[PDB]
Amino acid sequence: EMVRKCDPHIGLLHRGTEKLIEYKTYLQALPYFDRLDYVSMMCNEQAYSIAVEKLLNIQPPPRAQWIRVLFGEITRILNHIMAVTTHALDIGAMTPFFWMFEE
Amino acid sequence: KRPTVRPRSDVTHKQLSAFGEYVAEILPKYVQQVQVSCLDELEICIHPDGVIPTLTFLRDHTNAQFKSLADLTAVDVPTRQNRFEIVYNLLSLRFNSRIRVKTYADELTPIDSIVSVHIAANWYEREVWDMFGVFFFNHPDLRRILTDYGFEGHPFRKDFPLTGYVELRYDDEVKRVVAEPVELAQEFRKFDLNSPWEAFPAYRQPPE
Amino acid sequence: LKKTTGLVGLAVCDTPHERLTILYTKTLDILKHFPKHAAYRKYTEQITNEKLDMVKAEPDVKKLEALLQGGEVEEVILQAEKELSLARKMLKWKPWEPLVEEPPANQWKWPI
Amino acid sequence: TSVKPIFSRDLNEAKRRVRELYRAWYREVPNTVHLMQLDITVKQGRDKVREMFMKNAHVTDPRVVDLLVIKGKMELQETIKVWKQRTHVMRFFHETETPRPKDFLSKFYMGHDP
Amino acid sequence: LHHAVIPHGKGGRSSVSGVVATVFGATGFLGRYVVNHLGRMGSQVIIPYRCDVYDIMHLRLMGDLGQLTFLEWDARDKDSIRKAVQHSNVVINLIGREWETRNFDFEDVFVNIPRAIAQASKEAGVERFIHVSHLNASMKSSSKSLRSKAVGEKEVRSVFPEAIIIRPSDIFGREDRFLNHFANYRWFLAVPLVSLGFKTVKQPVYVADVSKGIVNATKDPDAVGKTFAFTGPNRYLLFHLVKYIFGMTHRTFIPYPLPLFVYSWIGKLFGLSPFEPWTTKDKVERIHISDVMPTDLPGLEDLGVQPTPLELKSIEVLRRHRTYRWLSSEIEETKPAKTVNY
Amino acid sequence: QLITVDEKLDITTLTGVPEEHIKTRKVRIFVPARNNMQSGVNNTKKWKMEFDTRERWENPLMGWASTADPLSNMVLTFSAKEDAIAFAEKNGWSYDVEEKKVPKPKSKSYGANFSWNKRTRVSTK
Amino acid sequence: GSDRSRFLEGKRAVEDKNIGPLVKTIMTRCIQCTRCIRFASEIAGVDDLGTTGRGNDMQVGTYIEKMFMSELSGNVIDICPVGALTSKPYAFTARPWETRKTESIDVMDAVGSNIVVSTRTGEVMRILPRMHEDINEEWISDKTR
Amino acid sequence: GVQVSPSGEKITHTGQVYDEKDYRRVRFVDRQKEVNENFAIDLIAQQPVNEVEHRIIACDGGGGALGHPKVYINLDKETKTGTCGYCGLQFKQHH
Amino acid sequence: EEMLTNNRIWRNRTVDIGVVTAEDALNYGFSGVMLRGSGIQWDLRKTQPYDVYDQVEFDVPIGSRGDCYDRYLCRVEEMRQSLRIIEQCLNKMPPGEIKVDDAKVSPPKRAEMKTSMESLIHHFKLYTEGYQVPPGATYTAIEAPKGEFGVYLVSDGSSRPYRCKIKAPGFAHLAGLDKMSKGHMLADVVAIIGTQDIVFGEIDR
Amino acid sequence: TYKYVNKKEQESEVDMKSATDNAARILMWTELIRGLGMTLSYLFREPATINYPFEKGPLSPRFRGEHALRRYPSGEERCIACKLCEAICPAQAITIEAEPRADGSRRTTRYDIDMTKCIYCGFCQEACPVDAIVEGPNFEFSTETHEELLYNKEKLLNNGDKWEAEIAANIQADYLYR
Amino acid sequence: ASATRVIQKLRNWASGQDLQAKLQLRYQEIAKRTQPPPKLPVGPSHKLSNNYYCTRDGRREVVPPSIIMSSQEKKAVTPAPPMKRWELSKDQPYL
Ligand SMILES: NC(=O)C1=CN([C@@H]2O[C@H](COP(=O)(O)OP(=O)(O)OC[C@H]3O[C@@H](n4cnc5c(N)ncnc54)[C@H](OP(=O)(O)O)[C@@H]3O)[C@@H](O)[C@H]2O)C=CC1
Ligand SMILES: CCCCCCCCCCCCO[C@@H]1O[C@H](CO)[C@@H](O[C@H]2O[C@H](CO)[C@@H](O)[C@H](O)[C@H]2O)[C@H](O)[C@H]1O
Ligand code: SF4
Ligand code: SF4
Ligand code: SF4
Ligand code: NA
Ligand SMILES: [Zn+2]
């Protein structure tokens, strides 16, 4: 049961998102970023939003930056619950998963 | 002060110009162009022979220390003879800066592999080979990474069709998943969106 | 003295001052084989001499680490070893030469 | 007309790598057929190997033959390590695909395509 | 042609083939191959079914969206037969049983139901009627099922004079009751063969060829009114066939003779089974009725199909009858059977 | 070190494209014509490469437009007529080039609308 | 232009004219550019379109009820820069971004006018002129269109 | 309204209906043709013409921001009504 | 935490497991907790701040052994530090508009779309052609919950992107799975996969 | 600012008082008993479960669910075949055809949403200038065949009439945020 | 909330926490599910004057990148000033 080599074969969920993005506008392409790290949705949208804003040379207004940091940190708590409890679920501790998925 | 236009800064653009001249003086054998965008991002465009030396100096030099390979990727521009632009995005934690190093390739001109410089690149170079068919010399394990086994073609090349050439279904006669030429009940509808009026006078090209 | 460096796998160096004096001097010697016109030599000698002076100037490890501005003095020793490694490779690469080959006319023109 | 070589310096030095790849593919058919429990014969498998090597019989640029050899080694490896499956190996045999007639009249009766 | 049936595309699933077939019996062994061939080329297929929906699930993935239409029917009710053949330009009859039940005997399945379908197809205005029968169908036949098939052919051609009649020999495939029937004799230690199997000749045909020629008859102009003989390319004595099968499964072959009347009496016991009989008297008879020689009847090759040898495709049927020790044995390890030109 | 390859570049065997769509396809190298409903000329600068139209038919279920052509929506963009030809050449597509149609220079003159004795005297503003 | 409106008043509305079965007029969209008037006068030689009224009430048209029938009349649809003059046969059927443009030739006559054929989902939508200086310039006959 | 064809199939408000011999009628066997029975053309014709005094009248469809973009209709052509291009309401001038 | 942090069966399954040294963390392309688990002091919210992250106060948890247990403690302590940030956002939330007051990029309000001719036009172009982005390229990265999440975006001047490369933090983490699993049992590979925080939507794309 | 999660080596001395505490921790499994306590406390908490389908999870008026075509209060269709929902649809899920009606109106003869291409992004709801296409609040419309999820115009108008009472009130509760 | 005071003591002690103060379930402290209408504010460019677009247009301020070097004693520099070492948290340096 000792591991000598690990050979991850990925690509079983390659869907050509980067090629599909090329046939979309900068708004039509936004929902693809929700489905990348599909546990960290609004954080992905922000990464895409900041890129286009840099290229557009525009600035989001003061309140929307606080909304984006507010939901940016809700998503982190979302992402860390999934990471921590599903990690504990693999190790064999299944109860914490049910406590935090209510949250 | 304009509440809609992005704050411009000043010092960072001056700093990255100084370092861009720095890099060009030291590696004159490889550097072909140095530019800094209005976003304030430094770009070094090198001859492909210079890849390994250029990323080695930028990694190990004391006034650089770009030790993280943020990512490596290619862009396909068919109008160019060397249609593949290879892009390295590097990160310096010591100086809290970023730098982009670009070289080029064609279909039959492989690049050297930087796996000896950044282990991070191992899978990134597999992805360039898979998606664009850019071979890398001295890669420890160059093989497809993202496409299906026995997939023919390089689907991120601009001339590769969006839906590809083959599709899969289960065939109960032979009792397995088979590949067949692609036919779509509904074709992907191409939209002509470009406006016929020029939006950016600053990027207008001479009509020569 | 330090209990730990705070980086996993970076071992505390008991005698950083001597260790750094070695590495910089080893680096200044290998630099003497470059052409006098090579920018890598001119610049890397400023950096090494700047950092060699500070070692001779500050006997205290904690006060030295603030002068060098490179993190724990174990990181600085590591970075000095990386620098000396590069000076060997640069000598064979000979990057000071003229440009190997210019790109086609519109290699870097964007947008097309 | 001068260009960097990949591996071979001209077509003859590249055919050496081709025959060496054909040898390896030839030695591996009896295993692929045995391990993957394919429903073909070795002779039928080996013929298919030969058919794929002759699909690229017109290539002459040495750099191109380098990249066909490079790909063929990748294909050989995907099969020896059983990263491919029955479905993947059996795709070479196009068993479910009716083949389009190559005569004008049959094409003319069948649709607008040339 | 009506504008909605002109064939477009390139004969893929999303194409239009111009065929709108109601296949009666698509839920059986040959049915899934007929629907798949029709479905893969882009044909509308109407599938009347009497079974549970669970039993027609494997057919759902045989056509693009919309190309398969499942209908409930009861063979006793005429009005349901009209409901299905109403919109077709071809009707294919594959109804059949290898045994008799309480509610349907060989006359019902092989005579009345085919005539009911053909009678409704003629009234509905269907261009083609493809009816499957048997190679050894004949009124002077020992087998009770094989006489009814002979009657059924004639009923069908009385009410649909231009019906196309397909006569396959024994069909062998993954779900057949032919090679899987003999491979299953191993459960009884020995293989009872009437006259030791040396008087019976068989010319079995692969199911995909039968189905591929049935579909080719849905579009061949020179098929209306003909009778076809679909047969394999090789004739074998039953003994050599049954011996070859056990060679393909690597089981121990211990053949012994058994007089037809003792063999016929055993088949009656297994026919008492309330479920699907393992064998029957009629199935034992048919196994030993020898294939007729092919004399003046167009065959598979006249419908553009090249018969597949029993050697290419046996291992896909028989590998599951092996033990672990022989699962991986390749086709070549088995000596091929011996053919006979009579 | 360089080698001599005395043959034109062909990469067809590396692109993984079925034989069907290399030998029977004709590409059209051209500059798009200005859309005549608008006056802008910004879509008339670059060269395009498009493939010959293939059959579309109506889906039986919904009436959508079905296709068996994988290259129907392929549109490459190039800066020069020569770059587009080279790309088609190294790919084996038979090409067909059309020369750029520029608007010929015209003589305008507001003062011509009031000519003392020429037919260019307009009768209304 | 700008991205805002600071116009807080009521808008004008002009009654439409019926000038034949080919060209639909919705003149509230007219920007009084007089391209139609100049085209008709100097390309078709049909001095029947003009401007009546004056000031903000000025309206293009024919005053009386005349049909703008001419073998070249359909070209006002192209040169009208807005939706004031649009094609009745084509009306409401497609949007520009949808359509695929195939650059073809016209065979209704022997002049061989260069045209563009818009198609959408395998169907012909409208014929448009393609510019060719030495043949049809930027016009086509109504039969072609 | 929901006319019925000679074949017995209901005709949708867009006038579509499979022919007699169209095989595609088989999809409705043991099922039904989804048809919307409130023909908007028939419903809009039932509304009365609103009479107004001025010669130019603005329609936004009602509900303000819950309607359609606000447009104006001329009412001079005193022989036909003015029709809203969005909602289809009709207007006519009082005198 | 009462169930995991001090539990001896949790510590045994996670302590000394998947140890990654700092210098190998950097050379493998790791980021986020895979960096800060090994002692490296890096957090893009701190070092290259975006939005209003340079106005909210919070601490970055650092590890000392770079194994599965330290990463677990860093993630648990980050959830507490996100709570620290959320409290500040709720009190410092300001009034104002929500999309940039520039209707050639961000569509106008529906009320204006149905009243102003400039607003309707801009609505029509934004929801059909979209806005044009000036030609150029950018590499934007954020401290996503898994680590540096980067977009390399190429604009050709039109309303559609030319190139869009996504830098998935989990892509390089998965490539370090082989390295982190030297001398471990199959039941540890299960733990090492979990500690890297793997979602394959980003890795594969 | 940074903090240490797993640093504590400010080593103290093992008193006999403290060593006996470490041993009782190890021998008596005290921290493992604390974990048993936490799951015991949860046993006597009220479960978070709701009694579906008799109880439903909360939703907001913005909820993006099944599509529908709306009308004006007079019964006229709102959709004017502008095709903006079609130009924005990220999934190319909407197909539209139009022509002049019998009364001359601009109206669609076709309007399809392939609900298996749709990503339920709600972008069509934003693009529509007359609130014709909306995503209603229905989410319980799973079918037994793929073909039933290809909605044509009749089906979508029927959903509009079915759900209008509830759609209209959700727009009334939310249009001021738009 | 409905739990008897005996079970509250039992589960407070078993957990070692005061659960009653911080319940996982939600009761009345949630917001009302029907709120009054909003009245959202406009932006800084909703002025009627002194608001020409060309003076607040960001997309048009972008320029092509500066070309520092191309094919068309000096002190050494770093890409930026060295990063400052982070300070240890005063709130809780050692969790
Ligand atoms: N070896 C062979 O397979 C050969 C077959 N044939 C003929 O080919 C045809 C099909 O062969 P095969 O596929 O093996 O037959 P199956 O045993 O597969 O049964 C075929 C179909 O008959 C249907 N069926 C039987 N009785 C009735 C009934 N009373 N009412 C309605 N449907 C009924 C079954 O439906 P359900 O499953 O719901 O009963 C089944 O779908 C038959 O005519 C058979 O005689 C000819 C020569 C050889
Ligand atoms: C004196 C004793 C003499 C020995 C007995 C004589 C031999 C009689 C038995 C022969 C073998 C019976 O073996 C039986 O074969 C039949 C024929 O396919 C199979 O019959 C059935 O199998 C599976 C079951 O779902 C179906 O897919 C198949 O279509 C159906 O026919 C049985 O699964 C098998 O059990
Ligand atoms: S061309 Fe059109 S916009 Fe110009 S004046 Fe004529 S009708 Fe009005
Ligand atoms: S919700 Fe999004 S994907 Fe679905 S129809 Fe509307 S725009 Fe298209
Ligand atoms: S639903 Fe709305 S956006 Fe779509 S075509 Fe109709 S009016 Fe236009
Ligand atoms: Na016009
Ligand atoms: Zn209106």
Render F10-39 in DSSP notation, one character per residue: --GGGTT--THHHHS-EEEEEPPPPPTT--
Please tell me the distance from the alpha carbon of residue E75 to that of residue E115, in angstroms, as a whole number.
11
Please tell me the distance from the alpha carbon of residue I168 to that of residue I174, in angstroms, as a whole number.
10
Backbone angles phi, psi at G132, to 5 degrees: -145, 110
Joined together, the tokens standing for residue J65 give: 């669910």
Sign of CA dihedral B61, B64, B65, B69: negative
User: What is the SS3 assignment for E67?
Assistant: coil
Interface check for K85 against chain C (CB to CB < 8 A): the answer is yes
Please tell me the distance from the alpha carbon of residue G90 to that of residue G86, in angstroms, as a whole number.
8
Interhelix angle J30-43/K5-15, rounded to 10 degrees, is: 150
Please tell me the distance from the alpha carbon of residue C86 to that of residue E35, in angstroms, as a whole number.
70
Domain count, chain E: 1
Q: Residue G10, exposed/middle/buried by CB under 10 A (0-12, 13-18, 19+)?
A: exposed
Say whether G30 counts as a known binding-site residue. Answer: yes
Q: Does the Cβ of G22 fall within 6 Å of ligand 3?
A: no
Domain boundaries, chain C: 1-112
User: What is the SS3 assignment for G33?
Assistant: coil
DSSP annotation of C98 reads P
The H-assigned helical ranges of F1-125 are: 20-23, 81-91
In the block, tokens 């065997």 appear at F13
Q: Does the Cβ of E50 fall within 6 Å of ligand 1?
A: yes
Please tell me the distance from the alpha carbon of residue I181 to that of residue I192, in angstroms, as a whole number.
7
Q: What residues contact E10, with CB distance under 8 A and at least 6 apart?
A: B181, B183, D100, D110, D111, D113, F68
Q: Of C10, K35, H65, E101, which Cα lies nearest the Cα of I113?
A: H65
Joined together, the tokens standing for residue G40 give: 């008709």
**CB neighbours of residue E225 within 10 Å:** 12
- CB pairs under 8 A, 24+ apart, for C14-17? C16/C61, C16/C64, C16/C73, C16/C74, C16/C76, C16/C77, C17/C55, C17/C59, C17/C61, C17/C64
Please tell me the distance from the alpha carbon of residue B61 to that of residue C41, in angstroms, as a whole number.
12
Residue H47: nearest ligand to its CA?
A: 7
* Preceding peptide of C111 cis, ω within 30°: yes
Q: Do F36 and G96 touch (CB under 8 A)?
A: no
Q: What single letter denotes the amino acid at residue G24?
A: K
Nearest residue on chain G to K53, alpha-carbon basis: G2
CA C58 and chain centroid, separation: 19
Please tell me the distance from the alpha carbon of residue C96 to that of residue C90, in angstroms, as a whole number.
9
> Measured in angstroms, how far is the CA atom of residue C11 from the centroid of ligand 2?
74
CA dihedral (B115, B116, B118, B121) in degrees, to 10, reads: 0
**CB neighbours of residue K47 within 10 Å:** 11
Q: What residues contact G4, with CB distance under 8 A and at least 6 apart?
A: I103, I116, I118, I119, K45, K46, K51, K53
Q: Of B132, B146, B34, which Cα lies nearest the Cα of B77?
A: B132
Contacting subunits of I (3+ beta carbon pairs below 8 A):
A, B, C, G, H, J, K
Contacting subunits of C (3+ beta carbon pairs below 8 A):
B, F, I, K
Find out whether E303 and E290 touch, Cβ atoms under 8 Å: no
Interface check for B46 against chain K (CB to CB < 8 A): the answer is no
Interface check for J114 against chain B (CB to CB < 8 A): the answer is yes
Give the domain range for residue D38.
1-114
Nearest residue on chain I to C9, alpha-carbon basis: I21
Q: Which residues partner with F28 through β-bridges?
A: F50, F96
Find out whether H44 and H33 touch, Cβ atoms under 8 Å: no
Q: Does the Cβ of J123 fall within 6 Å of ligand 4?
A: yes
Kindly report the protein residue whose alpha carbon is nearest to atom 2 of ligand 5.
Answer: J128
Q: Of E144, E143, E165, E146, which Cα lies nearest the Cα of E154?
A: E165
Give the domain range for residue F105.
1-125
Q: What single letter denotes the amino acid at residue D7?
A: F
Please tell me the distance from the alpha carbon of residue J33 to that of residue J44, in angstroms, as a whole number.
17
Q: Does the Cβ of J98 fall within 6 Å of ligand 5?
A: no
Q: Does the Cβ of E75 fall within 6 Å of ligand 1?
A: yes
Q: Give rounded-to-5 percent helix, strand, coil for chain G.
A: 15, 25, 60
Closest in J35, J39, J84 to I7, CB measured: J35
Please tell me the distance from the alpha carbon of residue K94 to that of residue I61, in angstroms, as a whole number.
10
Q: Do J87 and G95 touch (CB under 8 A)?
A: yes
Q: Do B201 and K56 touch (CB under 8 A)?
A: no
Find out whether I148 and I32 touch, Cβ atoms under 8 Å: yes
The angle formed by the CA atoms of residues K30, K31 and K36, to the nearest 5 degrees, is 170
Find out whether C112 and B205 touch, Cβ atoms under 8 Å: no
Q: What residues contact I56, with CB distance under 8 A and at least 6 apart?
A: A69, I85, I88, I89, I92
Find out whether I167 and A81 touch, Cβ atoms under 8 Å: no
Find out whether I23 and B119 touch, Cβ atoms under 8 Å: no
Q: Do K48 and G3 touch (CB under 8 A)?
A: no
Say whether G80 counts as a known binding-site residue. Answer: yes
**CB neighbours of residue B165 within 10 Å:** 19
Joined together, the tokens standing for residue A97 give: 């998963």
Kindly report the protein residue whose alpha carbon is nearest to atom 7 of ligand 2.
Answer: E185
Interface check for I171 against chain B (CB to CB < 8 A): the answer is yes
Q: Does the Cβ of J68 fall within 6 Å of ligand 5?
A: no
The length of chain J is 178
Q: Which of G14, G32, G52 has most ligand 3 atoms within 8 Å of CB, for mutation?
A: G32
Interface check for G78 against chain F (CB to CB < 8 A): the answer is yes
Q: Does the Cβ of G32 fall within 6 Å of ligand 3?
A: yes
Q: Do H85 and J106 touch (CB under 8 A)?
A: yes
User: What is the SS3 assignment for F94?
Assistant: strand
Please tell me the distance from the alpha carbon of residue K86 to that of residue B47, in angstroms, as a whole number.
39
Q: What residues contact C64, with CB distance under 8 A and at least 6 apart?
A: C16, C17, C54, C55, C58, C73
Nearest residue on chain J to G24, alpha-carbon basis: J104
Domain count, chain H: 1
Sign of CA dihedral B46, B49, B53, B55: positive
* Preceding peptide of J53 cis, ω within 30°: yes
Contacts of K89 in chain J (CB under 8 A): 1-3
Sign of CA dihedral C24, C29, C32, C38: negative
Backbone angles phi, psi at E37, to 5 degrees: -65, -45
- CB pairs under 8 A, 24+ apart, for J169-174? J169/J61, J170/J61, J170/J62, J170/J63, J170/J136, J170/J137, J171/H66, J171/J131, J171/J134, J172/H66, J173/J61, J173/K34, J174/J61, J174/J62
Q: Which residues partner with G51 through β-bridges?
A: G60
User: What is the SS3 assignment for H60?
Assistant: coil
Nearest residue on chain I to G2, alpha-carbon basis: I118
Q: Do G98 and B193 touch (CB under 8 A)?
A: no
Please tell me the distance from the alpha carbon of residue G30 to that of residue J100, in angstroms, as a whole number.
22
Q: Give rounded-to-5 percent helix, strand, coil for chain D.
A: 65, 0, 35
Kindly report the protein residue whose alpha carbon is nearest to atom 12 of ligand 2.
Answer: E278
Q: What single letter denotes the amino acid at residue I31?
A: S
Q: Do K58 and A61 touch (CB under 8 A)?
A: no
DSSP annotation of E301 reads G
Q: What single letter denotes the amino acid at residue A23?
A: Y
- What resolution in angstrom units was achieved for this structure? 2.8
Please tell me the distance from the alpha carbon of residue C75 to that of residue D73, in angstroms, as a whole number.
43
DSSP E205-231: EEHHHHHHHHHHHTT-GGGTT-EEEE-
Nearest residue on chain A to I205, alpha-carbon basis: A14
Find out whether A39 and I199 touch, Cβ atoms under 8 Å: yes
Please tell me the distance from the alpha carbon of residue C2 to that of residue C5, in angstroms, as a whole number.
7
